[PDB]
Amino acid sequence: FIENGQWEIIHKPSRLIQPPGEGQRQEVIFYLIIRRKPLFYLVNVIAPCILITLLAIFVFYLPPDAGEKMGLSIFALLTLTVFLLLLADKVPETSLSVPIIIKYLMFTMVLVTFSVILSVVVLNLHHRSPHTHQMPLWVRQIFIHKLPLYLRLKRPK
Amino acid sequence: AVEVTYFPFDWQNCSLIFRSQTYNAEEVEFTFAVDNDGKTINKIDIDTEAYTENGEWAIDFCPGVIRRHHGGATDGPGETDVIYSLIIRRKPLFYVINIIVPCVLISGLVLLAYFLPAQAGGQKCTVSINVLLAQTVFLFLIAQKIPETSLSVPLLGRFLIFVMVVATLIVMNCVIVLNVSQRTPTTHAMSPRLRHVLLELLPRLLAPEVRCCVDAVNFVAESTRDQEATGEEVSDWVRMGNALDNICFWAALVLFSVGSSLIFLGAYFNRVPDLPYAPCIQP
Amino acid sequence: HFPFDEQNCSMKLGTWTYDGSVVAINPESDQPDLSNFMESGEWVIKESRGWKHSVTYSCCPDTPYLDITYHFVMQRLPLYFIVNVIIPCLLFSFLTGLVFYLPTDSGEKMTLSISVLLSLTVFLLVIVELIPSTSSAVPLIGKYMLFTMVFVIASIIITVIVINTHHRSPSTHVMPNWVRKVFIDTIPNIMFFSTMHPEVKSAIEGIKYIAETMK
Amino acid sequence: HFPFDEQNCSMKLGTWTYDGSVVAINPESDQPDLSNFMESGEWVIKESRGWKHSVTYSCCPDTPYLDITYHFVMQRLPLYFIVNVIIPCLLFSFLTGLVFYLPTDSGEKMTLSISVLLSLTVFLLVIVELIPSTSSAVPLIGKYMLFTMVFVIASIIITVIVINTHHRSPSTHVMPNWVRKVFIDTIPNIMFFSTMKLIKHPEVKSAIEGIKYIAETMKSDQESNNAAAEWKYVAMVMDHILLGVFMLVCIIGTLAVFAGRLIELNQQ
Amino acid sequence: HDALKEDWQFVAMVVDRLFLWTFIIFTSVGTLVIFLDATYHLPPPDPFPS
Amino acid sequence: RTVDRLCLFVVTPVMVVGTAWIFLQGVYNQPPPQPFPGDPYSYNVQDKRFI
Amino acid sequence: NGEWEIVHRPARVNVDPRAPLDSPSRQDITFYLIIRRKPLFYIINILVPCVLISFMVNLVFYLPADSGEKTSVAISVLLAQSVFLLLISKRLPATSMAIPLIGKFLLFGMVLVTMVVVICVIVLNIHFRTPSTHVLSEGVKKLFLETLPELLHMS
Ligand SMILES: *[C@@H]1O[C@H](CO)[C@@H](O[C@@H]2O[C@H](CO)[C@@H](O[C@@H]3O[C@H](CO[C@H]4O[C@H](CO)[C@@H](O)[C@H](O)[C@@H]4O)[C@@H](O)[C@H](O[C@H]4O[C@H](CO)[C@@H](O)[C@H](O)[C@@H]4O)[C@@H]3O)[C@H](O)[C@H]2NC(C)=O)[C@H](O)[C@H]1NC(C)=O
Ligand SMILES: *[C@@H]1O[C@H](CO)[C@@H](O[C@@H]2O[C@H](CO)[C@@H](O[C@@H]3O[C@H](CO[C@H]4O[C@H](CO)[C@@H](O)[C@H](O)[C@@H]4O)[C@@H](O)[C@H](O[C@H]4O[C@H](CO)[C@@H](O)[C@H](O)[C@@H]4O)[C@@H]3O)[C@H](O)[C@H]2NC(C)=O)[C@H](O)[C@H]1NC(C)=O
Ligand SMILES: *[C@@H]1O[C@H](CO)[C@@H](O[C@@H]2O[C@H](CO)[C@@H](O[C@@H]3O[C@H](CO[C@H]4O[C@H](CO)[C@@H](O)[C@H](O)[C@@H]4O)[C@@H](O)[C@H](O[C@H]4O[C@H](CO)[C@@H](O)[C@H](O)[C@@H]4O)[C@@H]3O)[C@H](O)[C@H]2NC(C)=O)[C@H](O)[C@H]1NC(C)=O
Ligand SMILES: *[C@@H]1O[C@H](CO)[C@@H](O[C@@H]2O[C@H](CO)[C@@H](O[C@@H]3O[C@H](CO[C@H]4O[C@H](CO)[C@@H](O)[C@H](O)[C@@H]4O)[C@@H](O)[C@H](O[C@H]4O[C@H](CO)[C@@H](O)[C@H](O)[C@@H]4O)[C@@H]3O)[C@H](O)[C@H]2NC(C)=O)[C@H](O)[C@H]1NC(C)=O
Ligand SMILES: CCCCCCCC/C=C/CCCCCCCC(=O)O[C@@H](COC(=O)CCCCCCCCCCCCCCC)COP(=O)([O-])OCC[N+](C)(C)C
Ligand SMILES: *[C@@H]1O[C@H](CO)[C@@H](O[C@@H]2O[C@H](CO)[C@@H](O[C@@H]3O[C@H](CO)[C@@H](O)[C@H](O[C@H]4O[C@H](CO)[C@@H](O)[C@H](O)[C@@H]4O)[C@@H]3O)[C@H](O)[C@H]2NC(C)=O)[C@H](O)[C@H]1NC(C)=O
Ligand SMILES: CC(C)CCC[C@@H](C)[C@H]1CC[C@H]2[C@@H]3CC=C4C[C@@H](O)CC[C@]4(C)[C@H]3CC[C@]12C
Ligand SMILES: CC(C)CCC[C@@H](C)[C@H]1CC[C@H]2[C@@H]3CC=C4C[C@@H](O)CC[C@]4(C)[C@H]3CC[C@]12C
Ligand SMILES: CC(C)CCC[C@@H](C)[C@H]1CC[C@H]2[C@@H]3CC=C4C[C@@H](O)CC[C@]4(C)[C@H]3CC[C@]12C
Ligand SMILES: CC(C)CCC[C@@H](C)[C@H]1CC[C@H]2[C@@H]3CC=C4C[C@@H](O)CC[C@]4(C)[C@H]3CC[C@]12C
Ligand SMILES: CC(C)CCC[C@@H](C)[C@H]1CC[C@H]2[C@@H]3CC=C4C[C@@H](O)CC[C@]4(C)[C@H]3CC[C@]12C
Ligand SMILES: CC(C)CCC[C@@H](C)[C@H]1CC[C@H]2[C@@H]3CC=C4C[C@@H](O)CC[C@]4(C)[C@H]3CC[C@]12C
């Protein structure tokens, strides 16, 4: 038997299907229940998505003064777009449901997009003009007095 | 055979040649059929009611001719055939919407580099070289569509190569402007010729303790004086870079506009010629 | 209206060489038989019907030509194109406007905008692989793609204008009165959260000089 | 020599089951009939000829085996590959050298070089889908692609070295004497010169010592800035030399790849 | 001015660390959910289940 | 900068050695000397097996 | 062939003792082709560019933190590796018998480049610390300013 490198045969029964009950006809149906072997997609899609996701997480450890948060986050988005192009050749084209790998890809893209957005928010806070923007008191009380203790951020002095 | 010169704003001349496989002209000859009124139907007939036009191609003309040849004594028995000439016109809407217009806008973006500052945070080269990268992506996209012949260069390819060349020239110019603007007195000398040409000629053409304390104060004052003179020469360098940017923006805009306009006007005068034939599909 | 398009596709069937006077064709039923129809993962047949037609031409008033045309009205299932095409374009469209919340002093405004444009440009390769390429009309998905691209281009242009305004030095450029009236006075009212011995003589002149320079 | 290649393609015809002793084949003409040949948009047939051949094996002396082989010498039309492949490669090769005229303080040298490399990497899709996948020999266009890629990589490496040189300071490194001699002294001698080479009150005493401390501090930072400027000058001299070298190597490689075949075609 | 700028920058740092932890949590939860959904999708024990 | 230098000397040898290992599995990959393992015969016209 | 060299080419008469004599599967003659790929095209067009681009990511350690172009270089190398993976994805079947050698190298290099991006993030985080943000302890100074530099022969 010439075994397929992408499919494993789990079950292979055969059945006689009688007509429901003059022109009626029986059938002999040979069933093949087959499981895909997904090593190719683990190597070529899933692991890159995990790595890109890790980089998207690590954007938030990059200091604002480095001026590199946008570069890393948005080029991670560009890499995810390249992997969407990779998957476009392989996935089924039907519309009765969404493949779980596509769901994971869009989850990762939403994560990277939110990383871009929140990095922009952080940079907006960092580069805020002291002379032009007056700090509200609630911002002080939450983000300088209350929240830093829970995040294990001890401001010197 | 696809005449590629004005692709995608192109029209083609596709031949349908019919002949007897077995018999020569002396054995079998061809005549055109006639309509109800007796008019000879020397063309491709199309039923207007049942005809659905191709999504990309419009049939503008379709004459037919009966040719006889090879009737010479040396040639021997005469041969004949019937040739129909489908003159078809491409509807370029897909290429306009999906390729040409985005490419034109992205290629126009490099002109914006002239308006960014010539400083570390200005990101002039960022814009220029990344537009070039996008143009390379468009080259990949267009490779899957153009014909693969070499009798002439298609218009789409010619325009793409032109905008790539323009972007390369603007990248070089932006590099030169950044080189001129960032010059420091400690590392580069103040050339008076270039300054006169750009900033002057072009706009018109267009008790030991007391002594030690006093020495310290004087040293601080002279350091401040040196800093002010260094910053004034740096300012002169930035003004020279600004003038270079100002002139070269207009130069690059003229180049881009003229080249794009000529390339597309070459297609604008590429209509189907006014042949002495009735339309293939009567309106 | 793609990917939300409806298509009416027909199958005209007739005796090629026999006219109605020698062979008559009649539909078995008014609708095509869909009892053994396999479900599609891309289309839903909303309607189906068979119609007999007879045509008599002037040149042959005694030989009517018959046909039976079966038409199927079908609606596309758009989930594939919604998930794979619309959602990325929407993400890029949302990220386009984020540049105007990114400060100029970051030095990354052009990085963000130009890289969003680059991501959209690669997704154009994706769209060309997924969407059908025809020139009979501009599909709705193509209108959205062109809108997103023009949106990004406009964001880039206006971002360059904002950067140029931010970096305007006072020595070279001078504030017009209309700019001050529009942006520093009228507009900030709508909104809020922002605001607006000889050597001893030499040393004396040096101290006063440092003060004047700082002024 | 792809895409400037010449191909000799043959078509051998013969009676499969009849040998020369029972069926003899003779050419109708010395050359194939090209009277009704449609024009090709990719190839030009320079020469065409039909030759008859007879082969006799030692084990079968009496049964000669005949064939007629029609050969066609074809020259590729290279305009398509020149426009779509060669010119973008030449543009990237030209852009490779422009990093060495960029100032280090611009903060865009790596951006330019890396973006040129990314453009080349995207261009790899085009070149591999257009170039044939065969290992008989390296195509000339493939040689040019490899040359260009290798030299963008070299430019990136040397640009990293130059940027590291520019940022050296006395707080991190000490200028070697040989670097000074080679770059600040010898090379400018063979270069066009365009670049420069109650007093007892404690508060009063504290103020005096403070102004002294300020004076010494700014003197120290002036000396540090001078050493840093020396490093920057060395990096600038290296950058000018590399600009010249990379432009010359770009031209030399572009000629050395193609000009031999181009002259061979021009001389025929 | 430096003190007020430093206060703004410290607020930015605190917000950045909060977003770091939030992204770690959301990433871990979503990735675990998707991966467990994929891993536990096993072939049928019987060819004709009830 | 000290961390950068340490990470250079740690990471570059790892990548070099791993790449060399991965590609050296491929460089010295050739088919076996005989077509069939366990069969010494070469199945070549040079080594004719006369009756 | 322009890609395959024939190494061995045996011919064998195969008889199945288990199958019955009246079965078509009893006897066959098999002609085998052991063929070795000629890797010159793949070498020149993928492996040398891919390997060199992956190796260049080590250059980020020699870039200064003040350059502001470290993580950009590293993530761009990752993007180029992704493009190479896209190129390779079209040329082989999606079999699970083994990871291809080029696939193994690409996975290894992408993991390494991701680690390098993380290291660059950490280095940039360390570089931009100030007294108002972080406390520089005496132990950290002892380890990273004196001991390690003379271990590492730093200037
Ligand atoms: C998708 O595309 C198809 C094809 O274009 C459309 O099909 C049309 O469907 C309509 C019905 O909705 C058809 O109209 C009907 O045709 C019947 C057959 O006509 C033939 O036979 C009679 C003799 O019996 C001849 O006189 C006639 O000339 C034809 O040869 C008629 O019997 C119907 O008549 C009924 O409606 C009219 C309305 O004016 C009444 O006056 C009558 O009394 C009677 O109630 C009717 O005319 C049409 O012919 C179909 N076209 C074709 C080519 O098949 C689909 O509708 C379309 N689907 C969409 C868009 O939803
Ligand atoms: C592209 O590739 C093709 C091959 O596929 C080349 O074709 C060869 O062309 C040369 C001529 O340029 C051929 O050589 C000529 O062969 C003739 C026939 O030879 C057969 O018949 C004789 C007589 O029975 C036998 O002896 C012989 O073995 C063959 O069976 C000869 O008649 C020609 O004679 C000429 O040369 C001799 C020796 O110099 C002189 O003495 C004669 O007077 C005369 O000048 C000649 O030998 C060759 O056979 C072709 N090969 C094939 C397989 O067709 C193309 O040339 C090549 N194109 C290019 C440009 O490279
Ligand atoms: C792979 O795909 C095949 C189909 O291509 C699946 O085979 C089907 O499997 C299901 C479940 O095993 C079968 O459904 C069951 O059929 C039984 C027999 O039905 C026939 O005989 C009765 C006689 O009275 C007729 O009335 C009927 O029309 C059929 O001709 C039923 O007895 C079963 O009833 C059970 O389910 C119903 C609900 O649907 C309950 O109301 C009942 O109480 C009872 O619990 C059931 O309907 C189906 O017939 C199979 N199709 C075939 C053989 O073509 C494989 O299961 C699938 N494999 C996997 C792993 O997914
Ligand atoms: C390329 O691919 C081909 C297949 O397409 C390979 O050919 C196979 O090669 C292997 C090894 O040479 C063969 O396996 C061997 O078959 C021998 C004969 O088996 C037949 O004859 C016996 C007679 O008693 C029958 O019982 C049996 O059913 C068969 O009809 C065995 O004797 C060999 O056993 C030896 O090795 C095993 C371990 O593998 C030991 O346990 C035994 O004790 C003994 O030492 C062995 O099984 C196989 O039959 C070939 N397949 C064919 C011809 O179709 C090529 O080898 C491969 N080339 C490469 C990879 O280079
Ligand atoms: C390849 C990937 C890994 C690369 C690792 C490279 C390592 C490079 C090595 C450098 C270590 C740092 C040396 C200098 C600073 C030490 C002193 C200091 O301020 O410590 C700080 C904490 O420590 C850190 O901030 C450590 C750096 C961040 C680690 C992030 C998690 C691990 C890596 C990411 C996840 C990897 C796995 C997932 C992704 C693959 C602050 O300390 P403190 O709170 O003030 O406490 C006071 C006492 N003390 C000051 C004496 C400490
Ligand atoms: C679409 O394609 C068709 C078919 O190619 C084409 O019709 C052909 O056009 C050519 C001209 O381009 C015709 O050839 C001419 O025939 C007349 C006799 O009928 C000759 O007198 C002409 O001679 C002139 O051109 C010669 C060129 O070699 C000169 O040597 C000579 O001195 C004359 O100047 C010429 O040979 C050909 O007969 C027709 N074929 C038909 C109609 O069947 C048609 O024009 C194309 N339509 C377009 C492009 O709109
Ligand atoms: C580099 C810039 C200036 C131009 C970019 C467009 C290029 C591709 C254009 C400019 C001039 C063009 C050439 C002009 C004329 C001819 C002669 C014609 O019989 C075949 C095509 C050919 C040979 C063209 C090929 C394409 C071409 C080389
Ligand atoms: C793009 C800018 C910079 C340069 C434009 C140069 C113009 C004159 C060039 C560009 C492309 C050229 C055309 C390309 C190909 C052909 C087909 C050939 O059978 C006749 C000449 C013709 C029609 C060329 C005429 C000259 C042409 C229009
Ligand atoms: C580090 C910078 C300077 C880039 C250096 C690139 C070097 C290593 C490149 C340039 C050209 C390359 C060669 C080009 C072609 C071949 C032939 C074949 O057998 C594959 C390997 C081999 C022999 C390559 C080995 C690596 C090579 C020598
Ligand atoms: C081996 C078979 C039984 C499957 C077992 C499930 C394995 C593969 C799943 C279960 C939980 C998963 C982890 C859950 C969350 C994360 C964090 C994310 O940032 C990277 C991936 C990572 C680290 C996942 C890796 C794969 C994982 C370990
Ligand atoms: C370490 C990096 C550059 C990865 C690539 C390593 C490559 C270029 C090296 C590693 C070991 C080398 C092989 C080692 C020894 C031999 C035998 C000799 O006949 C030359 C070729 C050959 C077969 C070499 C080919 C090139 C090779 C495979
Ligand atoms: C850094 C330099 C060496 C470039 C990287 C080279 C990498 C890709 C290595 C990996 C495997 C290597 C090949 C493996 C085997 C051989 C041996 C011999 O047949 C010539 C060289 C050749 C064909 C090697 C060329 C270089 C090679 C392709």
Task: Identify whether the C-beta of residue D114 lies closer than 8 Å to the C-beta of residue C111.
Answer: no
Write the burial class of residue D123 (CB in 10 Å: 0-12 exposed, 13-18 middle, 19+ buried): buried
C108 Cβ contact list (under 8 Å, min separation 6):
A67, A68, A69, A70, A71, A123, C102
Tokens coding A112: 């990277």
The rounded Å distance from CA D242 to ligand 12 centre is: 29
Of E8, E10, E16, the CB nearest to A155: E10
- Residue whose CA lies nearest to ligand 10 atom number 21: A50
Nearest ligand to the CA of B256 is 8
- In angstroms, what is the resolution? 2.1
Interface check for G73 against chain A (CB to CB < 8 A): the answer is no
Establish whether residue F40 lines the binding site of ligand 4, counting it when its CB lies within 6 angstroms of any ligand atom. no
- B and E touch per CB criterion (3+ pairs under 8 A): no
The technique by which this structure was obtained is cryo-EM
C177 Cβ contact list (under 8 Å, min separation 6):
none
Judging contacts by C-beta atoms under 8 Å, the chain D residues touching residue G59 are: 156-157, 160
The rounded Å distance from CA F33 to ligand 4 centre is: 16
Tokens coding A154: 């001890």
First to last CA, chain B: 29
The rounded Å distance from CA A44 to ligand 8 centre is: 45
Give chain B's largest Cα–Cα span: 133
Task: Give exposure, G54-71, as e/b (b: 16+ Cβ within 10 Å).
Answer: bbbbbbbbebbbebbbbb
Task: Identify whether the C-beta of residue B198 lies closer than 8 Å to the C-beta of residue B246.
Answer: no
**Cα–Cα distance, C176 to C179 (Å, whole number):** 5
How many CB atoms are located within 10 Å of the residue E38 CB?
Answer: 14
Q: Quote the distance between the C-alpha of residue B181 and its chain's center.
A: 31
Q: What are the φ and ψ backbone dihedral angles of G39, each rounded to 5 degrees?
A: -90, 15
Angle between helices A69-88 and C87-97 (to 10 degrees): 160
Interface check for G132 against chain E (CB to CB < 8 A): the answer is yes
Of A75, A85, A133, the CB nearest to C193: A133
- Residue whose CA lies nearest to ligand 11 atom number 4: F20
The rounded Å distance from CA D52 to ligand 2 centre is: 9
- DSSP secondary structure of D182-219: IIIIIGGGGS---S---TTSHHHHHHHHHHHHHHHHHH
- Identity (one letter) of the amino acid at B144? Q
**Cα–Cα distance, A51 to A76 (Å, whole number):** 10
How many CB atoms are located within 10 Å of the residue C205 CB?
Answer: 14
Q: Which of residues 9-48 of F touch G (CB under 8 A)?
A: 9, 11-12, 14-16, 18-19, 22-23, 25-26, 30-31, 34-36, 42-43
Task: Identify whether the C-beta of residue C102 lies closer than 8 Å to the C-beta of residue C112.
Answer: yes
Say whether C52 sits in a helix, a strand or coil. strand
**Cα–Cα distance, D133 to D29 (Å, whole number):** 37
Residue ranges of alpha helices (H) inside chain C are 79-81, 87-97, 109-130, 140-166, 177-179, 187-190, 198-214
- Residue whose CA lies nearest to ligand 1 atom number 1: C8
CB contact under 8 A, A133 and C98: no
Which residue is it, tokens 């988005």?
Answer: A77
CB contact under 8 A, G132 and E13: no
Tokens coding B230: 């260094």
- Identity (one letter) of the amino acid at A132? T
- Identity (one letter) of the amino acid at C68? I
Overall size of chain C counted in residues: 215
Tokens coding C121: 């440009």
Q: Quote the distance between the C-alpha of residue G67 and its chain's center.
A: 27
Say whether E20 sits in a helix, a strand or coil. helix
C76 Cβ contact list (under 8 Å, min separation 6):
A95, C2, C3, C4, C5, C6, C7, C42, C43
Judging contacts by C-beta atoms under 8 Å, the chain D residues touching residue G80 are: 117-118, 121
Q: How many helices (H) and strands (E) does chain F have?
A: 1, 0
- Testing ligand 9's pocket by substitution, the residue of D96, D145, D150, D159 carrying the most ligand atoms inside 8 A of its CB is D150
